[PDB]
Design a protein around this nucleic acid. Structure first.
Length: 493
DNA sequence: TGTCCCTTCGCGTCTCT
DNA sequence: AGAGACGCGAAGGGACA
């Protein structure tokens, strides 16, 4: 290794191989993952006390152990969990999944210890739910957020008039301490002076690097409205999704993108108001010329692609794969744009490229279909899940390709497909639903929760005793999945 | 090298009308 | 049926021992 011993590497690969062995079954991918973000101590620690974690009172799974370990100060968090998980679950009624969630971050030790020490006073004397306290603690520097939340919550509600929900929202991100403090300082300023609603101020603070966004907004808000004729509501749009980098990068690249490349400021806002807005803007500054050419999109389409989380990646991947896709697999740019105009555009294109042949030949789909699957957020996930589950759904469960495509052709296709697999039997035989019904419920966004909800309402006939018959529940569930079904229970208090 | 904290970016799912 | 809200997590940097 890039050693801090002499000859110990020897004693430290004995260990590496044993973790592939009987308690944990670790492939390289994981050992890598641990080493990379955990360190050698992390890897040593896992071996050191692997048996203590898998049985005994903790009964963690390998995948959980990996999750806790693969972080800066993994060793500490592994050692801490051993001590505190039993007490946190018994003395404060948290589930293990919850303790593991807190542990699986940088400085987990500090979060776990701070949760034990402060969970009561937050729940008791500030009327917080433990769910909320876990939310605050489940990030980097939870200790800090927790502590800050204790100190400032009374102030922010009494003085600055905020709900506790709002304060939790702010604290429940990385660097929450900073955001909280920063809001305290700037809330009066930003509201009275710069004319913002406190709701907008929370929006801004309620992301990562919220401190940075707030500060930057106070600084740049007048400039952007005066010198670049933007509305405050647009400046907040940017500050809320893009943060400091985006605001700064907008000021900088707005004149350039409207003189030279000729975009409407309305569109520049659209591009910047996302994660890595900076990256998108800089990428569309370049690459816009060369996009539009050699397989040549209109500016509207470039904007469309860029106006999403990871726009840079989409744009770079489009420019790279647009030819091979259009020519070697015969797709109109119209369709490639569709695929790339969602979160994970890069992932979708790449997955399509590699899976198009497979799906069309081995499973007998038209391209029109494959593109419909890929033209949603999480395309890569749906495509890959179609591949796995198409055979077994058609045979074991007796469905048809067009139907499987219909389920998959929505946001969260993967989930719908998998959930159908789980529930199609129990629903059909045990509750007398027709497969056509089950597919109709699932052929929508939120298809999984729809299905899960509908089961729970029949299996253990929840509050509305018999009110509606099953064909209605299905109708409702297709009409607006879990929301509509939940909105019916909540009509008998 | 390790531990802790903060910021930025990217991918995926559900809801709200 | 498109936008916005929400959740999750990798990556990268700074401060300190």
């Amino acid at each position: 290794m890039q050693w801090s011993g002499a000859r110990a590497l020897e004693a430290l690969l004995t260990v590496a191989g044993e973790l592939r062995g009987p308690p944990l079954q670790l492939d390289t991918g994981q050992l890598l993952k641990i080493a990379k973000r955990g360190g050698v101590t992390a890897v040593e620690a896992v071996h050191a006390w692997r048996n203590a974690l898998t049985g005994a009172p903790l009964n963690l799974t390998p995948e959980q152990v990996v999750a806790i370990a693969s972080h800066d100060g993994g060793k500490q968090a592994l050692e801490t969990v051993q001590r505190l998980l039993p007490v946190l679950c018994q003395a404060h009624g948290l589930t293990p999944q919850q303790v593991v969630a807190i542990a699986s971050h940088d400085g987990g030790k500090q979060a776990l210890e701070t949760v034990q020490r402060l969970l009561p006073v937050l729940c008791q004397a500030h009327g917080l739910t433990p769910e909320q306290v876990v939310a605050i603690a489940s990030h980097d520097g939870g200790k800090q957020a927790l502590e800050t939340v204790q100190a400032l919550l009374p102030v922010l509600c009494q003085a600055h008039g905020l709900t506790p929900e709002q304060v939790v929202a702010i604290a429940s991100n990385g660097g929450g301490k900073q955001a909280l403090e920063t809001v305290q300082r700037l809330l009066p300023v930003l509201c009275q002076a710069h004319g913002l609603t406190p709701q907008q101020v929370v929006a801004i603070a309620s992301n990562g690097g919220g401190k940075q966004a707030l500060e930057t907004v106070q600084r740049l808000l007048p400039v952007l409205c005066q010198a670049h004729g933007l509305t405050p509501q647009q400046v907040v749009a940017i500050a809320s999704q893009g943060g400091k980098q985006a605001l700064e990068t907008v000021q900088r690249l707005l004149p350039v993108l409207c003189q030279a490349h000729g975009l409407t400021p309305q569109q520049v806002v659209a591009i910047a108001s996302n994660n890595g807005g900076k990256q998108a803007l800089e990428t569309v500054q370049r690459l816009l010329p060369v996009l539009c050419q050699a397989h040549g999109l209109t500016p509207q389409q470039v904007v469309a692609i860029a106006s999403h989380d990871g726009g840079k990646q989409a744009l770079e991947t489009v420019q790279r794969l647009l030819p091979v896709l259009c020519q070697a697999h015969g797709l109109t740019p119209q369709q490639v744009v569709a695929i790339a105009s969602n979160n994970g555009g890069k992932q979708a294109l790449e997955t399509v490229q590699r899976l198009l042949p497979v799906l069309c030949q081995a499973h007998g789909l038209t391209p029109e279909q494959v593109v419909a699957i890929a033209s949603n957020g999480g395309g890569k996930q749906a495509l890959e899940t179609v591949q796995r589950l198409l055979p077994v759904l058609c045979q074991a469960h007796g469905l048809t390709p067009e139907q499987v495509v219909a389920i998959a052709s929505h946001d969260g296709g993967k989930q719908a497909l998998e959930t159908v697999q789980r529930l199609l039997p129990v629903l059909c035989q045990a509750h007398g639903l027709t497969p056509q019904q089950v597919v109709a419920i699932a052929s929508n966004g939120g298809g999984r929760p729809a299905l899960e909800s509908i089961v729970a309402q029949l299996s253990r006939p929840d509050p509305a005793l018999a009110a509606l018959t099953n064909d209605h529940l299905v109708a409702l569930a297709c009409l607006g999945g879990r929301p509509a079904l939940d909105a019916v229970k909540k009509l008998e208090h």
